[model samples]
Target: SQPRAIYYVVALQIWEYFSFYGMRALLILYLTNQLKYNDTHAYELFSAYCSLVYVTPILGGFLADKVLGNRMAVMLGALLMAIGHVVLGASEIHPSFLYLSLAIIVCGYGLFKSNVSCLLGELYEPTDPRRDGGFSLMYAAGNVGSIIAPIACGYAQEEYSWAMGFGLAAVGMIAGLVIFLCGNRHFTHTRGVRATNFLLPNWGWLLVLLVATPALITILFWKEWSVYALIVATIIGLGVLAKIYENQKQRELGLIVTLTFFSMLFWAFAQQGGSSISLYIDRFVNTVPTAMFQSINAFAVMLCGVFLAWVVNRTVRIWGKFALGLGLMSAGFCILTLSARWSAMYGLPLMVLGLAVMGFAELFIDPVAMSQITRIEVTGVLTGIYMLLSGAIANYLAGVIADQTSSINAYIEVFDQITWGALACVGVVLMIWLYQA
Candidate 1:
């Protein structure tokens, strides 16, 4: 059986994803329609925002490891996210509000994301048999919130007002914060490191980080150079990880670095759901709301991701899982290519199927990687680094790909490239498996 504390973590994840995905699903559409941005510009800003969301975890994780610990980090994260969503609800009042709200969310999410997972990891003994299954179950439960998010937020935005849509997102974050606070007794195991008086209290340092960092991010957003900064940060981040691996000589850490590379490649294609594919649905698929299409992937995760997680945890090797994921992703991209080619004839169903396949692919990679990271020391920092590679770096690459595909033919061309890329990666994994054997 799983630890009781993990149930609260799992519940928190659901509302957190609900809040995050609701805003995210509406982002591109809100940009193009409400904010009146061009396709390239909208894609660029959306990508930048997503990159920032993933990138901040590095610092958050480090702080959690060294000082604040998981419990403090999560409480602060939830509070900031709730505030961000509330500010975002007022974005229609001024364009500056958009950037401000995004900055708040970036700082907040950076603290929340990795710390919670690390907290979950701590709930089990290092060698617990149920740890992997718990991670998978948490992932699947998170998808339930994601499934509801897009459909509800999309409908709200379409029928009522963007403010109302964002307000609902705010509600989720607030609810999550309350739920987490109510379960505070369960997290006695994950409290802060010893107090440090580095010119101020820990709260003072946290305030400095959260308040000051967002201003820099807002500047990056205005300058439109967030992608460049993300690239540089990723390079430096990976270089640091490489050094750590060399010094520590830990096999699990080495495996994490290796898997991170493959994870980056996979997510670069998979994340196009929020970028290129989302726009394609907006322009072509009249059968449903564009944001609502985001639900299909989440629904697939809730259904197939859970079942596959049970089987893979018990039976499949990690390398085999990676190969399977990439193979399935390649097939999904191929399906998407076909959907784009024959939009009038078989677009919607094919698109849904393709996205579902991609969602299934995630089950094999992300949770498996998280499960392994729990075995490593400094779980918070390592988890952040993992997300930095797969989330920050991959989102930036996805944006670049999305920026190039404004036309239907361009979309098909890019989808084909992604399909081949995935297949090539699958071959690489298989070749490694052969060498290992």
Candidate 2:
């Protein structure tokens, strides 16, 4: 059986996913319909938000590793995210508040994201075989939140009010915070407490993080410099990661980085569900609310996660999953491409099938990646870098792909490229496997 702490962590993650994905389901629609942004501008801003959200986790992870500790950082993140959601509900008051709220949520997510996973990692010995299963449960539980968020929040946004939708999201985060606090007693082995001696008390650093991080993030959001920020940050982050790999002379660390890059291709294509695919569903498919479509992927994850965990634990080695993930994503994109070419009558169901296939592909990559992080050094920082490269880079590329969806032809063309890219990633993965073998 998994430790008791794992349950609470997974439960808290479920609500966090609910809070984040709830807002995410509405974001592009809010940008285009409510905020009245053009497609290009909306895609750019959405991509920037996704990229920045992942970027902050590096700093968050560093702080957790060095100062605040994972538990405190989780509290700080939960509170800020709750506040950000509250502010988001009032975005109609002014456009500035929308941008500012996003910035606040971005910083808060940074603090929360990497640290929570690191905390979960602390529950197991480095060589524990159950680690992947625990992370798998967490990933699946998160999809529970993802499945509910779009349905609940999307209905409120469409049937009642945008504020109501965002308000529901706020409640989810608050609920998650309350759950985490109440369950702190279960974390016997890993308290997520501070590990190092520092120049200031933990509260002092907390004050600075609360005050400064959001302010800096707000400037980036306001100036629309997020793409540039991602570019510079990626360069520096990869350089630093490489230095660590080289200086430490750990081949396994370098291997993790390589696998992370291949996984990025999967995410870059899969992530279009929120951006390009959401818009396509709105304009072309017309079978469901765009926001509600977000649930399909998560629903697939929830259903398939446990079964795949069992199958993988029995038959698959870790590297084989990477190949399978890439190959399956390629297959899903082909199905989507076929739907794009066929009669419009068959489009919606085919698209759903394609998305479900792609969703199944996620189980082979994300949780497996997180499981690998525990056995390596700098657990927090490596997790941060994993999020940075996989999510930050993928979302940016996904946005670029999103920008091309002005027509059905463009959408078809984009998926064609994505299919080829996934295949290319598979080839690379096989090559790496050969080298490692």
Candidate 3:
């Protein structure tokens, strides 16, 4: 029953990922094509939705850690998510309906995201050898869901009806909830400790929710509102965090800020997979099913993780050379931009190669950065805050960039120009350092 329960938990997480990405694969396309929104406008809305999805996890993690236990939070989140998915699948041609569905989904994800991961962390003893392996298996399950969902949902959407595909994702989530509920007893002895003395006042949540209302309205009505809201929220949040660290004698606050800035770049690049890259696949690539391109990163994650782990073990110095990973990431961006050009001239193969290379770069940087972040933080809530802040900045910037270009092709050209210019500057700096060395 021990490992059996863990397997069920992992399966539930995988199913959750399937529902999430399956819907995501269709979101932009549905917005632009079916709903008749401009590409730029759609991306802006999408970015805002995604930013909120991540931001809510801060509250979710706090509540799970301090008030609701992990089991209760996960169950509550799953119920919300199932309802959201049903609403999403039932969305008619109305923009209001779509927005409402998206809001529900965002709230559900916010509640579910951090708490489920906390559950996985609780499944193993601190020093268990299988702990890392358990997480690895769980991660692989997520990718499996990712790989299958797009292809399956894409097929249903393309061949049958878009709503059918969306509905299937909802079904998957329901199945996951059932399995998770069946395994509830396993988590009875699990760690779901609360900071009883550090609880946030109910009015604190009310104030946060009250502040969020304008942001939501702005998202629905005034697109530019996201920019201002994000700026204010980020500044206020960071200011508070800094004061907290100063009061606590934690000098690592400055380093955390620096890392968050750099991480913004990573997230900006990573998120392009959904916006710019998705558009590129739709316009340039010729595939039997275009949505399959969404799976490239999932596959790359699986293969590249094994390869990087081997490389890190064989040549230990490579692990310390953090610049190398960053360099690879920059190069990946350049390659992706070049692939757009090549797709225009040559074909889809180059685009596939570019995505695979970008996936490899992600393998090197993402895990390292996440591990480093955990080492810098003593508490789970702080880690959640760090992630939300990084994601918020990245999503906001991506929205701004996406809104600049008119069409998919125009976006491709703009992306190429910006990426190449950035790469060239980095290349120049590296060359000067090499010459001096």
Evaluated with TM-score, which candidate comes out highest?
1
**What's model 1's TM-score?**
0.86
Q: Residue 42 in model 1: shift from native, Å?
A: 1.6
lDDT of each: 0.78, 0.77, 0.68
Per lDDT, the best of the predicted structures is 1
> Which tens-of-lDDT digit does each residue in 368-392 have in candidate 1?
7778887675664677678888888
| Per-residue lDDT of candidate 3, residues 266-312 (tens digit) | 56666755676776677765434566677777777668877766774
Q: How many pairs in model 2 have backbone atoms within 3 A of each other, for residues 3 or more apart or on separate chains, i.e. clashes? A: 0
- Give the backbone clash total of model 3: 0
Instruction: Indicate the residue-level lDDT of 94 in model 2.
Output: 61
My TM-score estimates for the predictions, one after another, are 0.86, 0.84, 0.84
lDDT per residue, candidate 2, 1-437, as tens digits? 97777778888999999999999998888878877678888887888888778778777655776656676777778887899899988888766777778878887897888778777867788888888988978867888889999998988887788888999999999898888888454332323445345655556666666675556455545646667777788898888787675455444676687768887877888887568877777777622377887898888776677687476441245568788889888888888777766735343578887788788787667766778887765775677778888988998888888877657778888877888888888877777676656
